């Protein structure tokens with residue numbers, strides 16, 4: 107849509123990703139599809155090292171290129187972390203690193219597994235005729251058995267899909283403001299709030315499909331990166347591409363465009379900077395180039411917040427606040443998820459840091475506080 111690559115149904119997610127790569131890249135696909143066994147047996151690192159350097163010229167279309175990022179990304183996590191108990195690799199082999207860095211530079215992403223790879227491009231629906239729902243859906247790749255990566259990635263994707271129904275309304279909002287259509291704008295804001303209220307109901311599903319203790323110990327360490335990590339302090343070195351090591355943050359739904367999309371829409375100045383603003387601005391370089399341009403386009407438009415405040419209209423303020431309260435609800439709920447899935451598990455292991463690399467609990471509360479302080483009320 108307007109070459110921002112936002113689908114009506116699935117939003118920022120890649121609609122119907124490719125499952126198979128071309129025959130030339132089978133050596134990659136065998137390692138990626140059999141990750142749980144190769145890590146467990148302990149021949150994952152041997153297979154990656156004994157591997158030819160494959161050129162990325164044969165990947166024709168965009169879906170082929172992104173599938174390769176997902177394939178190469180999951181292998182890079184598997185190689186660096188290994189069994190995930192302590193033993194790590196600081197150097198990444200030239201035969202896998204150089205094609206991955208060249209592919210990453212083409213798509214304007216960092217050479218590391220990101221939200222766009224492991225959530226947005228890491229899914230398939232089982233029956234094409236059936237609708238988008240957890241029973242019908244499945245991921246393409248997993249790290250280990252009992253990591254709960256299916257339940258984890260698909261619930262993130264299902265909320266992304268829930269937010270898509272709000273994202274398609276955004277043109278109506280800016281069209282109504284320009285054309286000076288009060289009733290259209292009020293209806294559009296209420297529709298967005300309704301869609302954001304529904305995304306919170308989709309969020310409830312995470313308790314059914316993700317074990318807290320299994321998520322923290324097993325899956326979290328594979329999603330982690332190497333930007334301010336004590337295990338890789340200097341960072342990872344990509345052989346035959348850069349001389350020194352390079353630091354790149356781990357995967358996180360901080361790299362989701364939906365969070366910033368609606369804050370930017372509603373004039374919630376998160377990136378206006380401080381400790382928390384710095385992080386959210388950095389995450390846009392881990393987003394795809396098209397979605398980075400979408401968040402650009404929203405900031406360029408006239409402020410929806412300024413428009414609503416000027417009119418002296420309790421109806422518009424209600425509808426505006428409905429959207430803002432929905433965001434406060436999502437962020438209030440997301441903190442309860444963090445309490446269950448990080449804080450309580452972390453205390454059982456004989457300010458904690460997230461995969462993105464932030465003092466998470468004070469970071470998230472600052473972000474929620476900024477959202478809550480944007481409620482208009484009586485003007």
Ligand code: HEM
Pocket residue numbers: 261262263265266316321358359360361362364365366437440443444447448459460461462463464465466469470473474
């Ligand atoms: C077990 C599940 C989850 C955990 C443990 C978790 C944890 C965190 C943590 C620690 C942060 C702070 C940044 C960082 O250090 O990475 C964060 C940020 C964020 N998370 Fe999650 N998260 C989970 C699920 C979700 C889901 C399902 C979504 C959306 C569909 C989401 C959206 C976000 C967003 C947008 C941010 C950026 C800050 C903000 O805008 O509020 N998270 N998450």
Ligand SMILES: N[C@@H](Cc1c[nH]c2ccccc12)C(=O)O
Pocket residue numbers: 220221224225262326329357358359448459460461462
């Ligand atoms: N940031 C989370 C991990 C996480 C949550 N949602 C994600 C989506 C994709 C990749 C990683 C994540 C943590 O520190 O535990």
Ligand SMILES: OCCc1c[nH]c2ccccc12
Pocket residue numbers: 265269302305364365366368433436437440
């Ligand atoms: O931290 C909560 C995640 C979140 C923030 N804003 C959103 C908008 C839609 C869906 C999820 C979120």
Ligand SMILES: [C-]#N
Pocket residue numbers: 357358359360
């Ligand atoms: C959410 N990371």
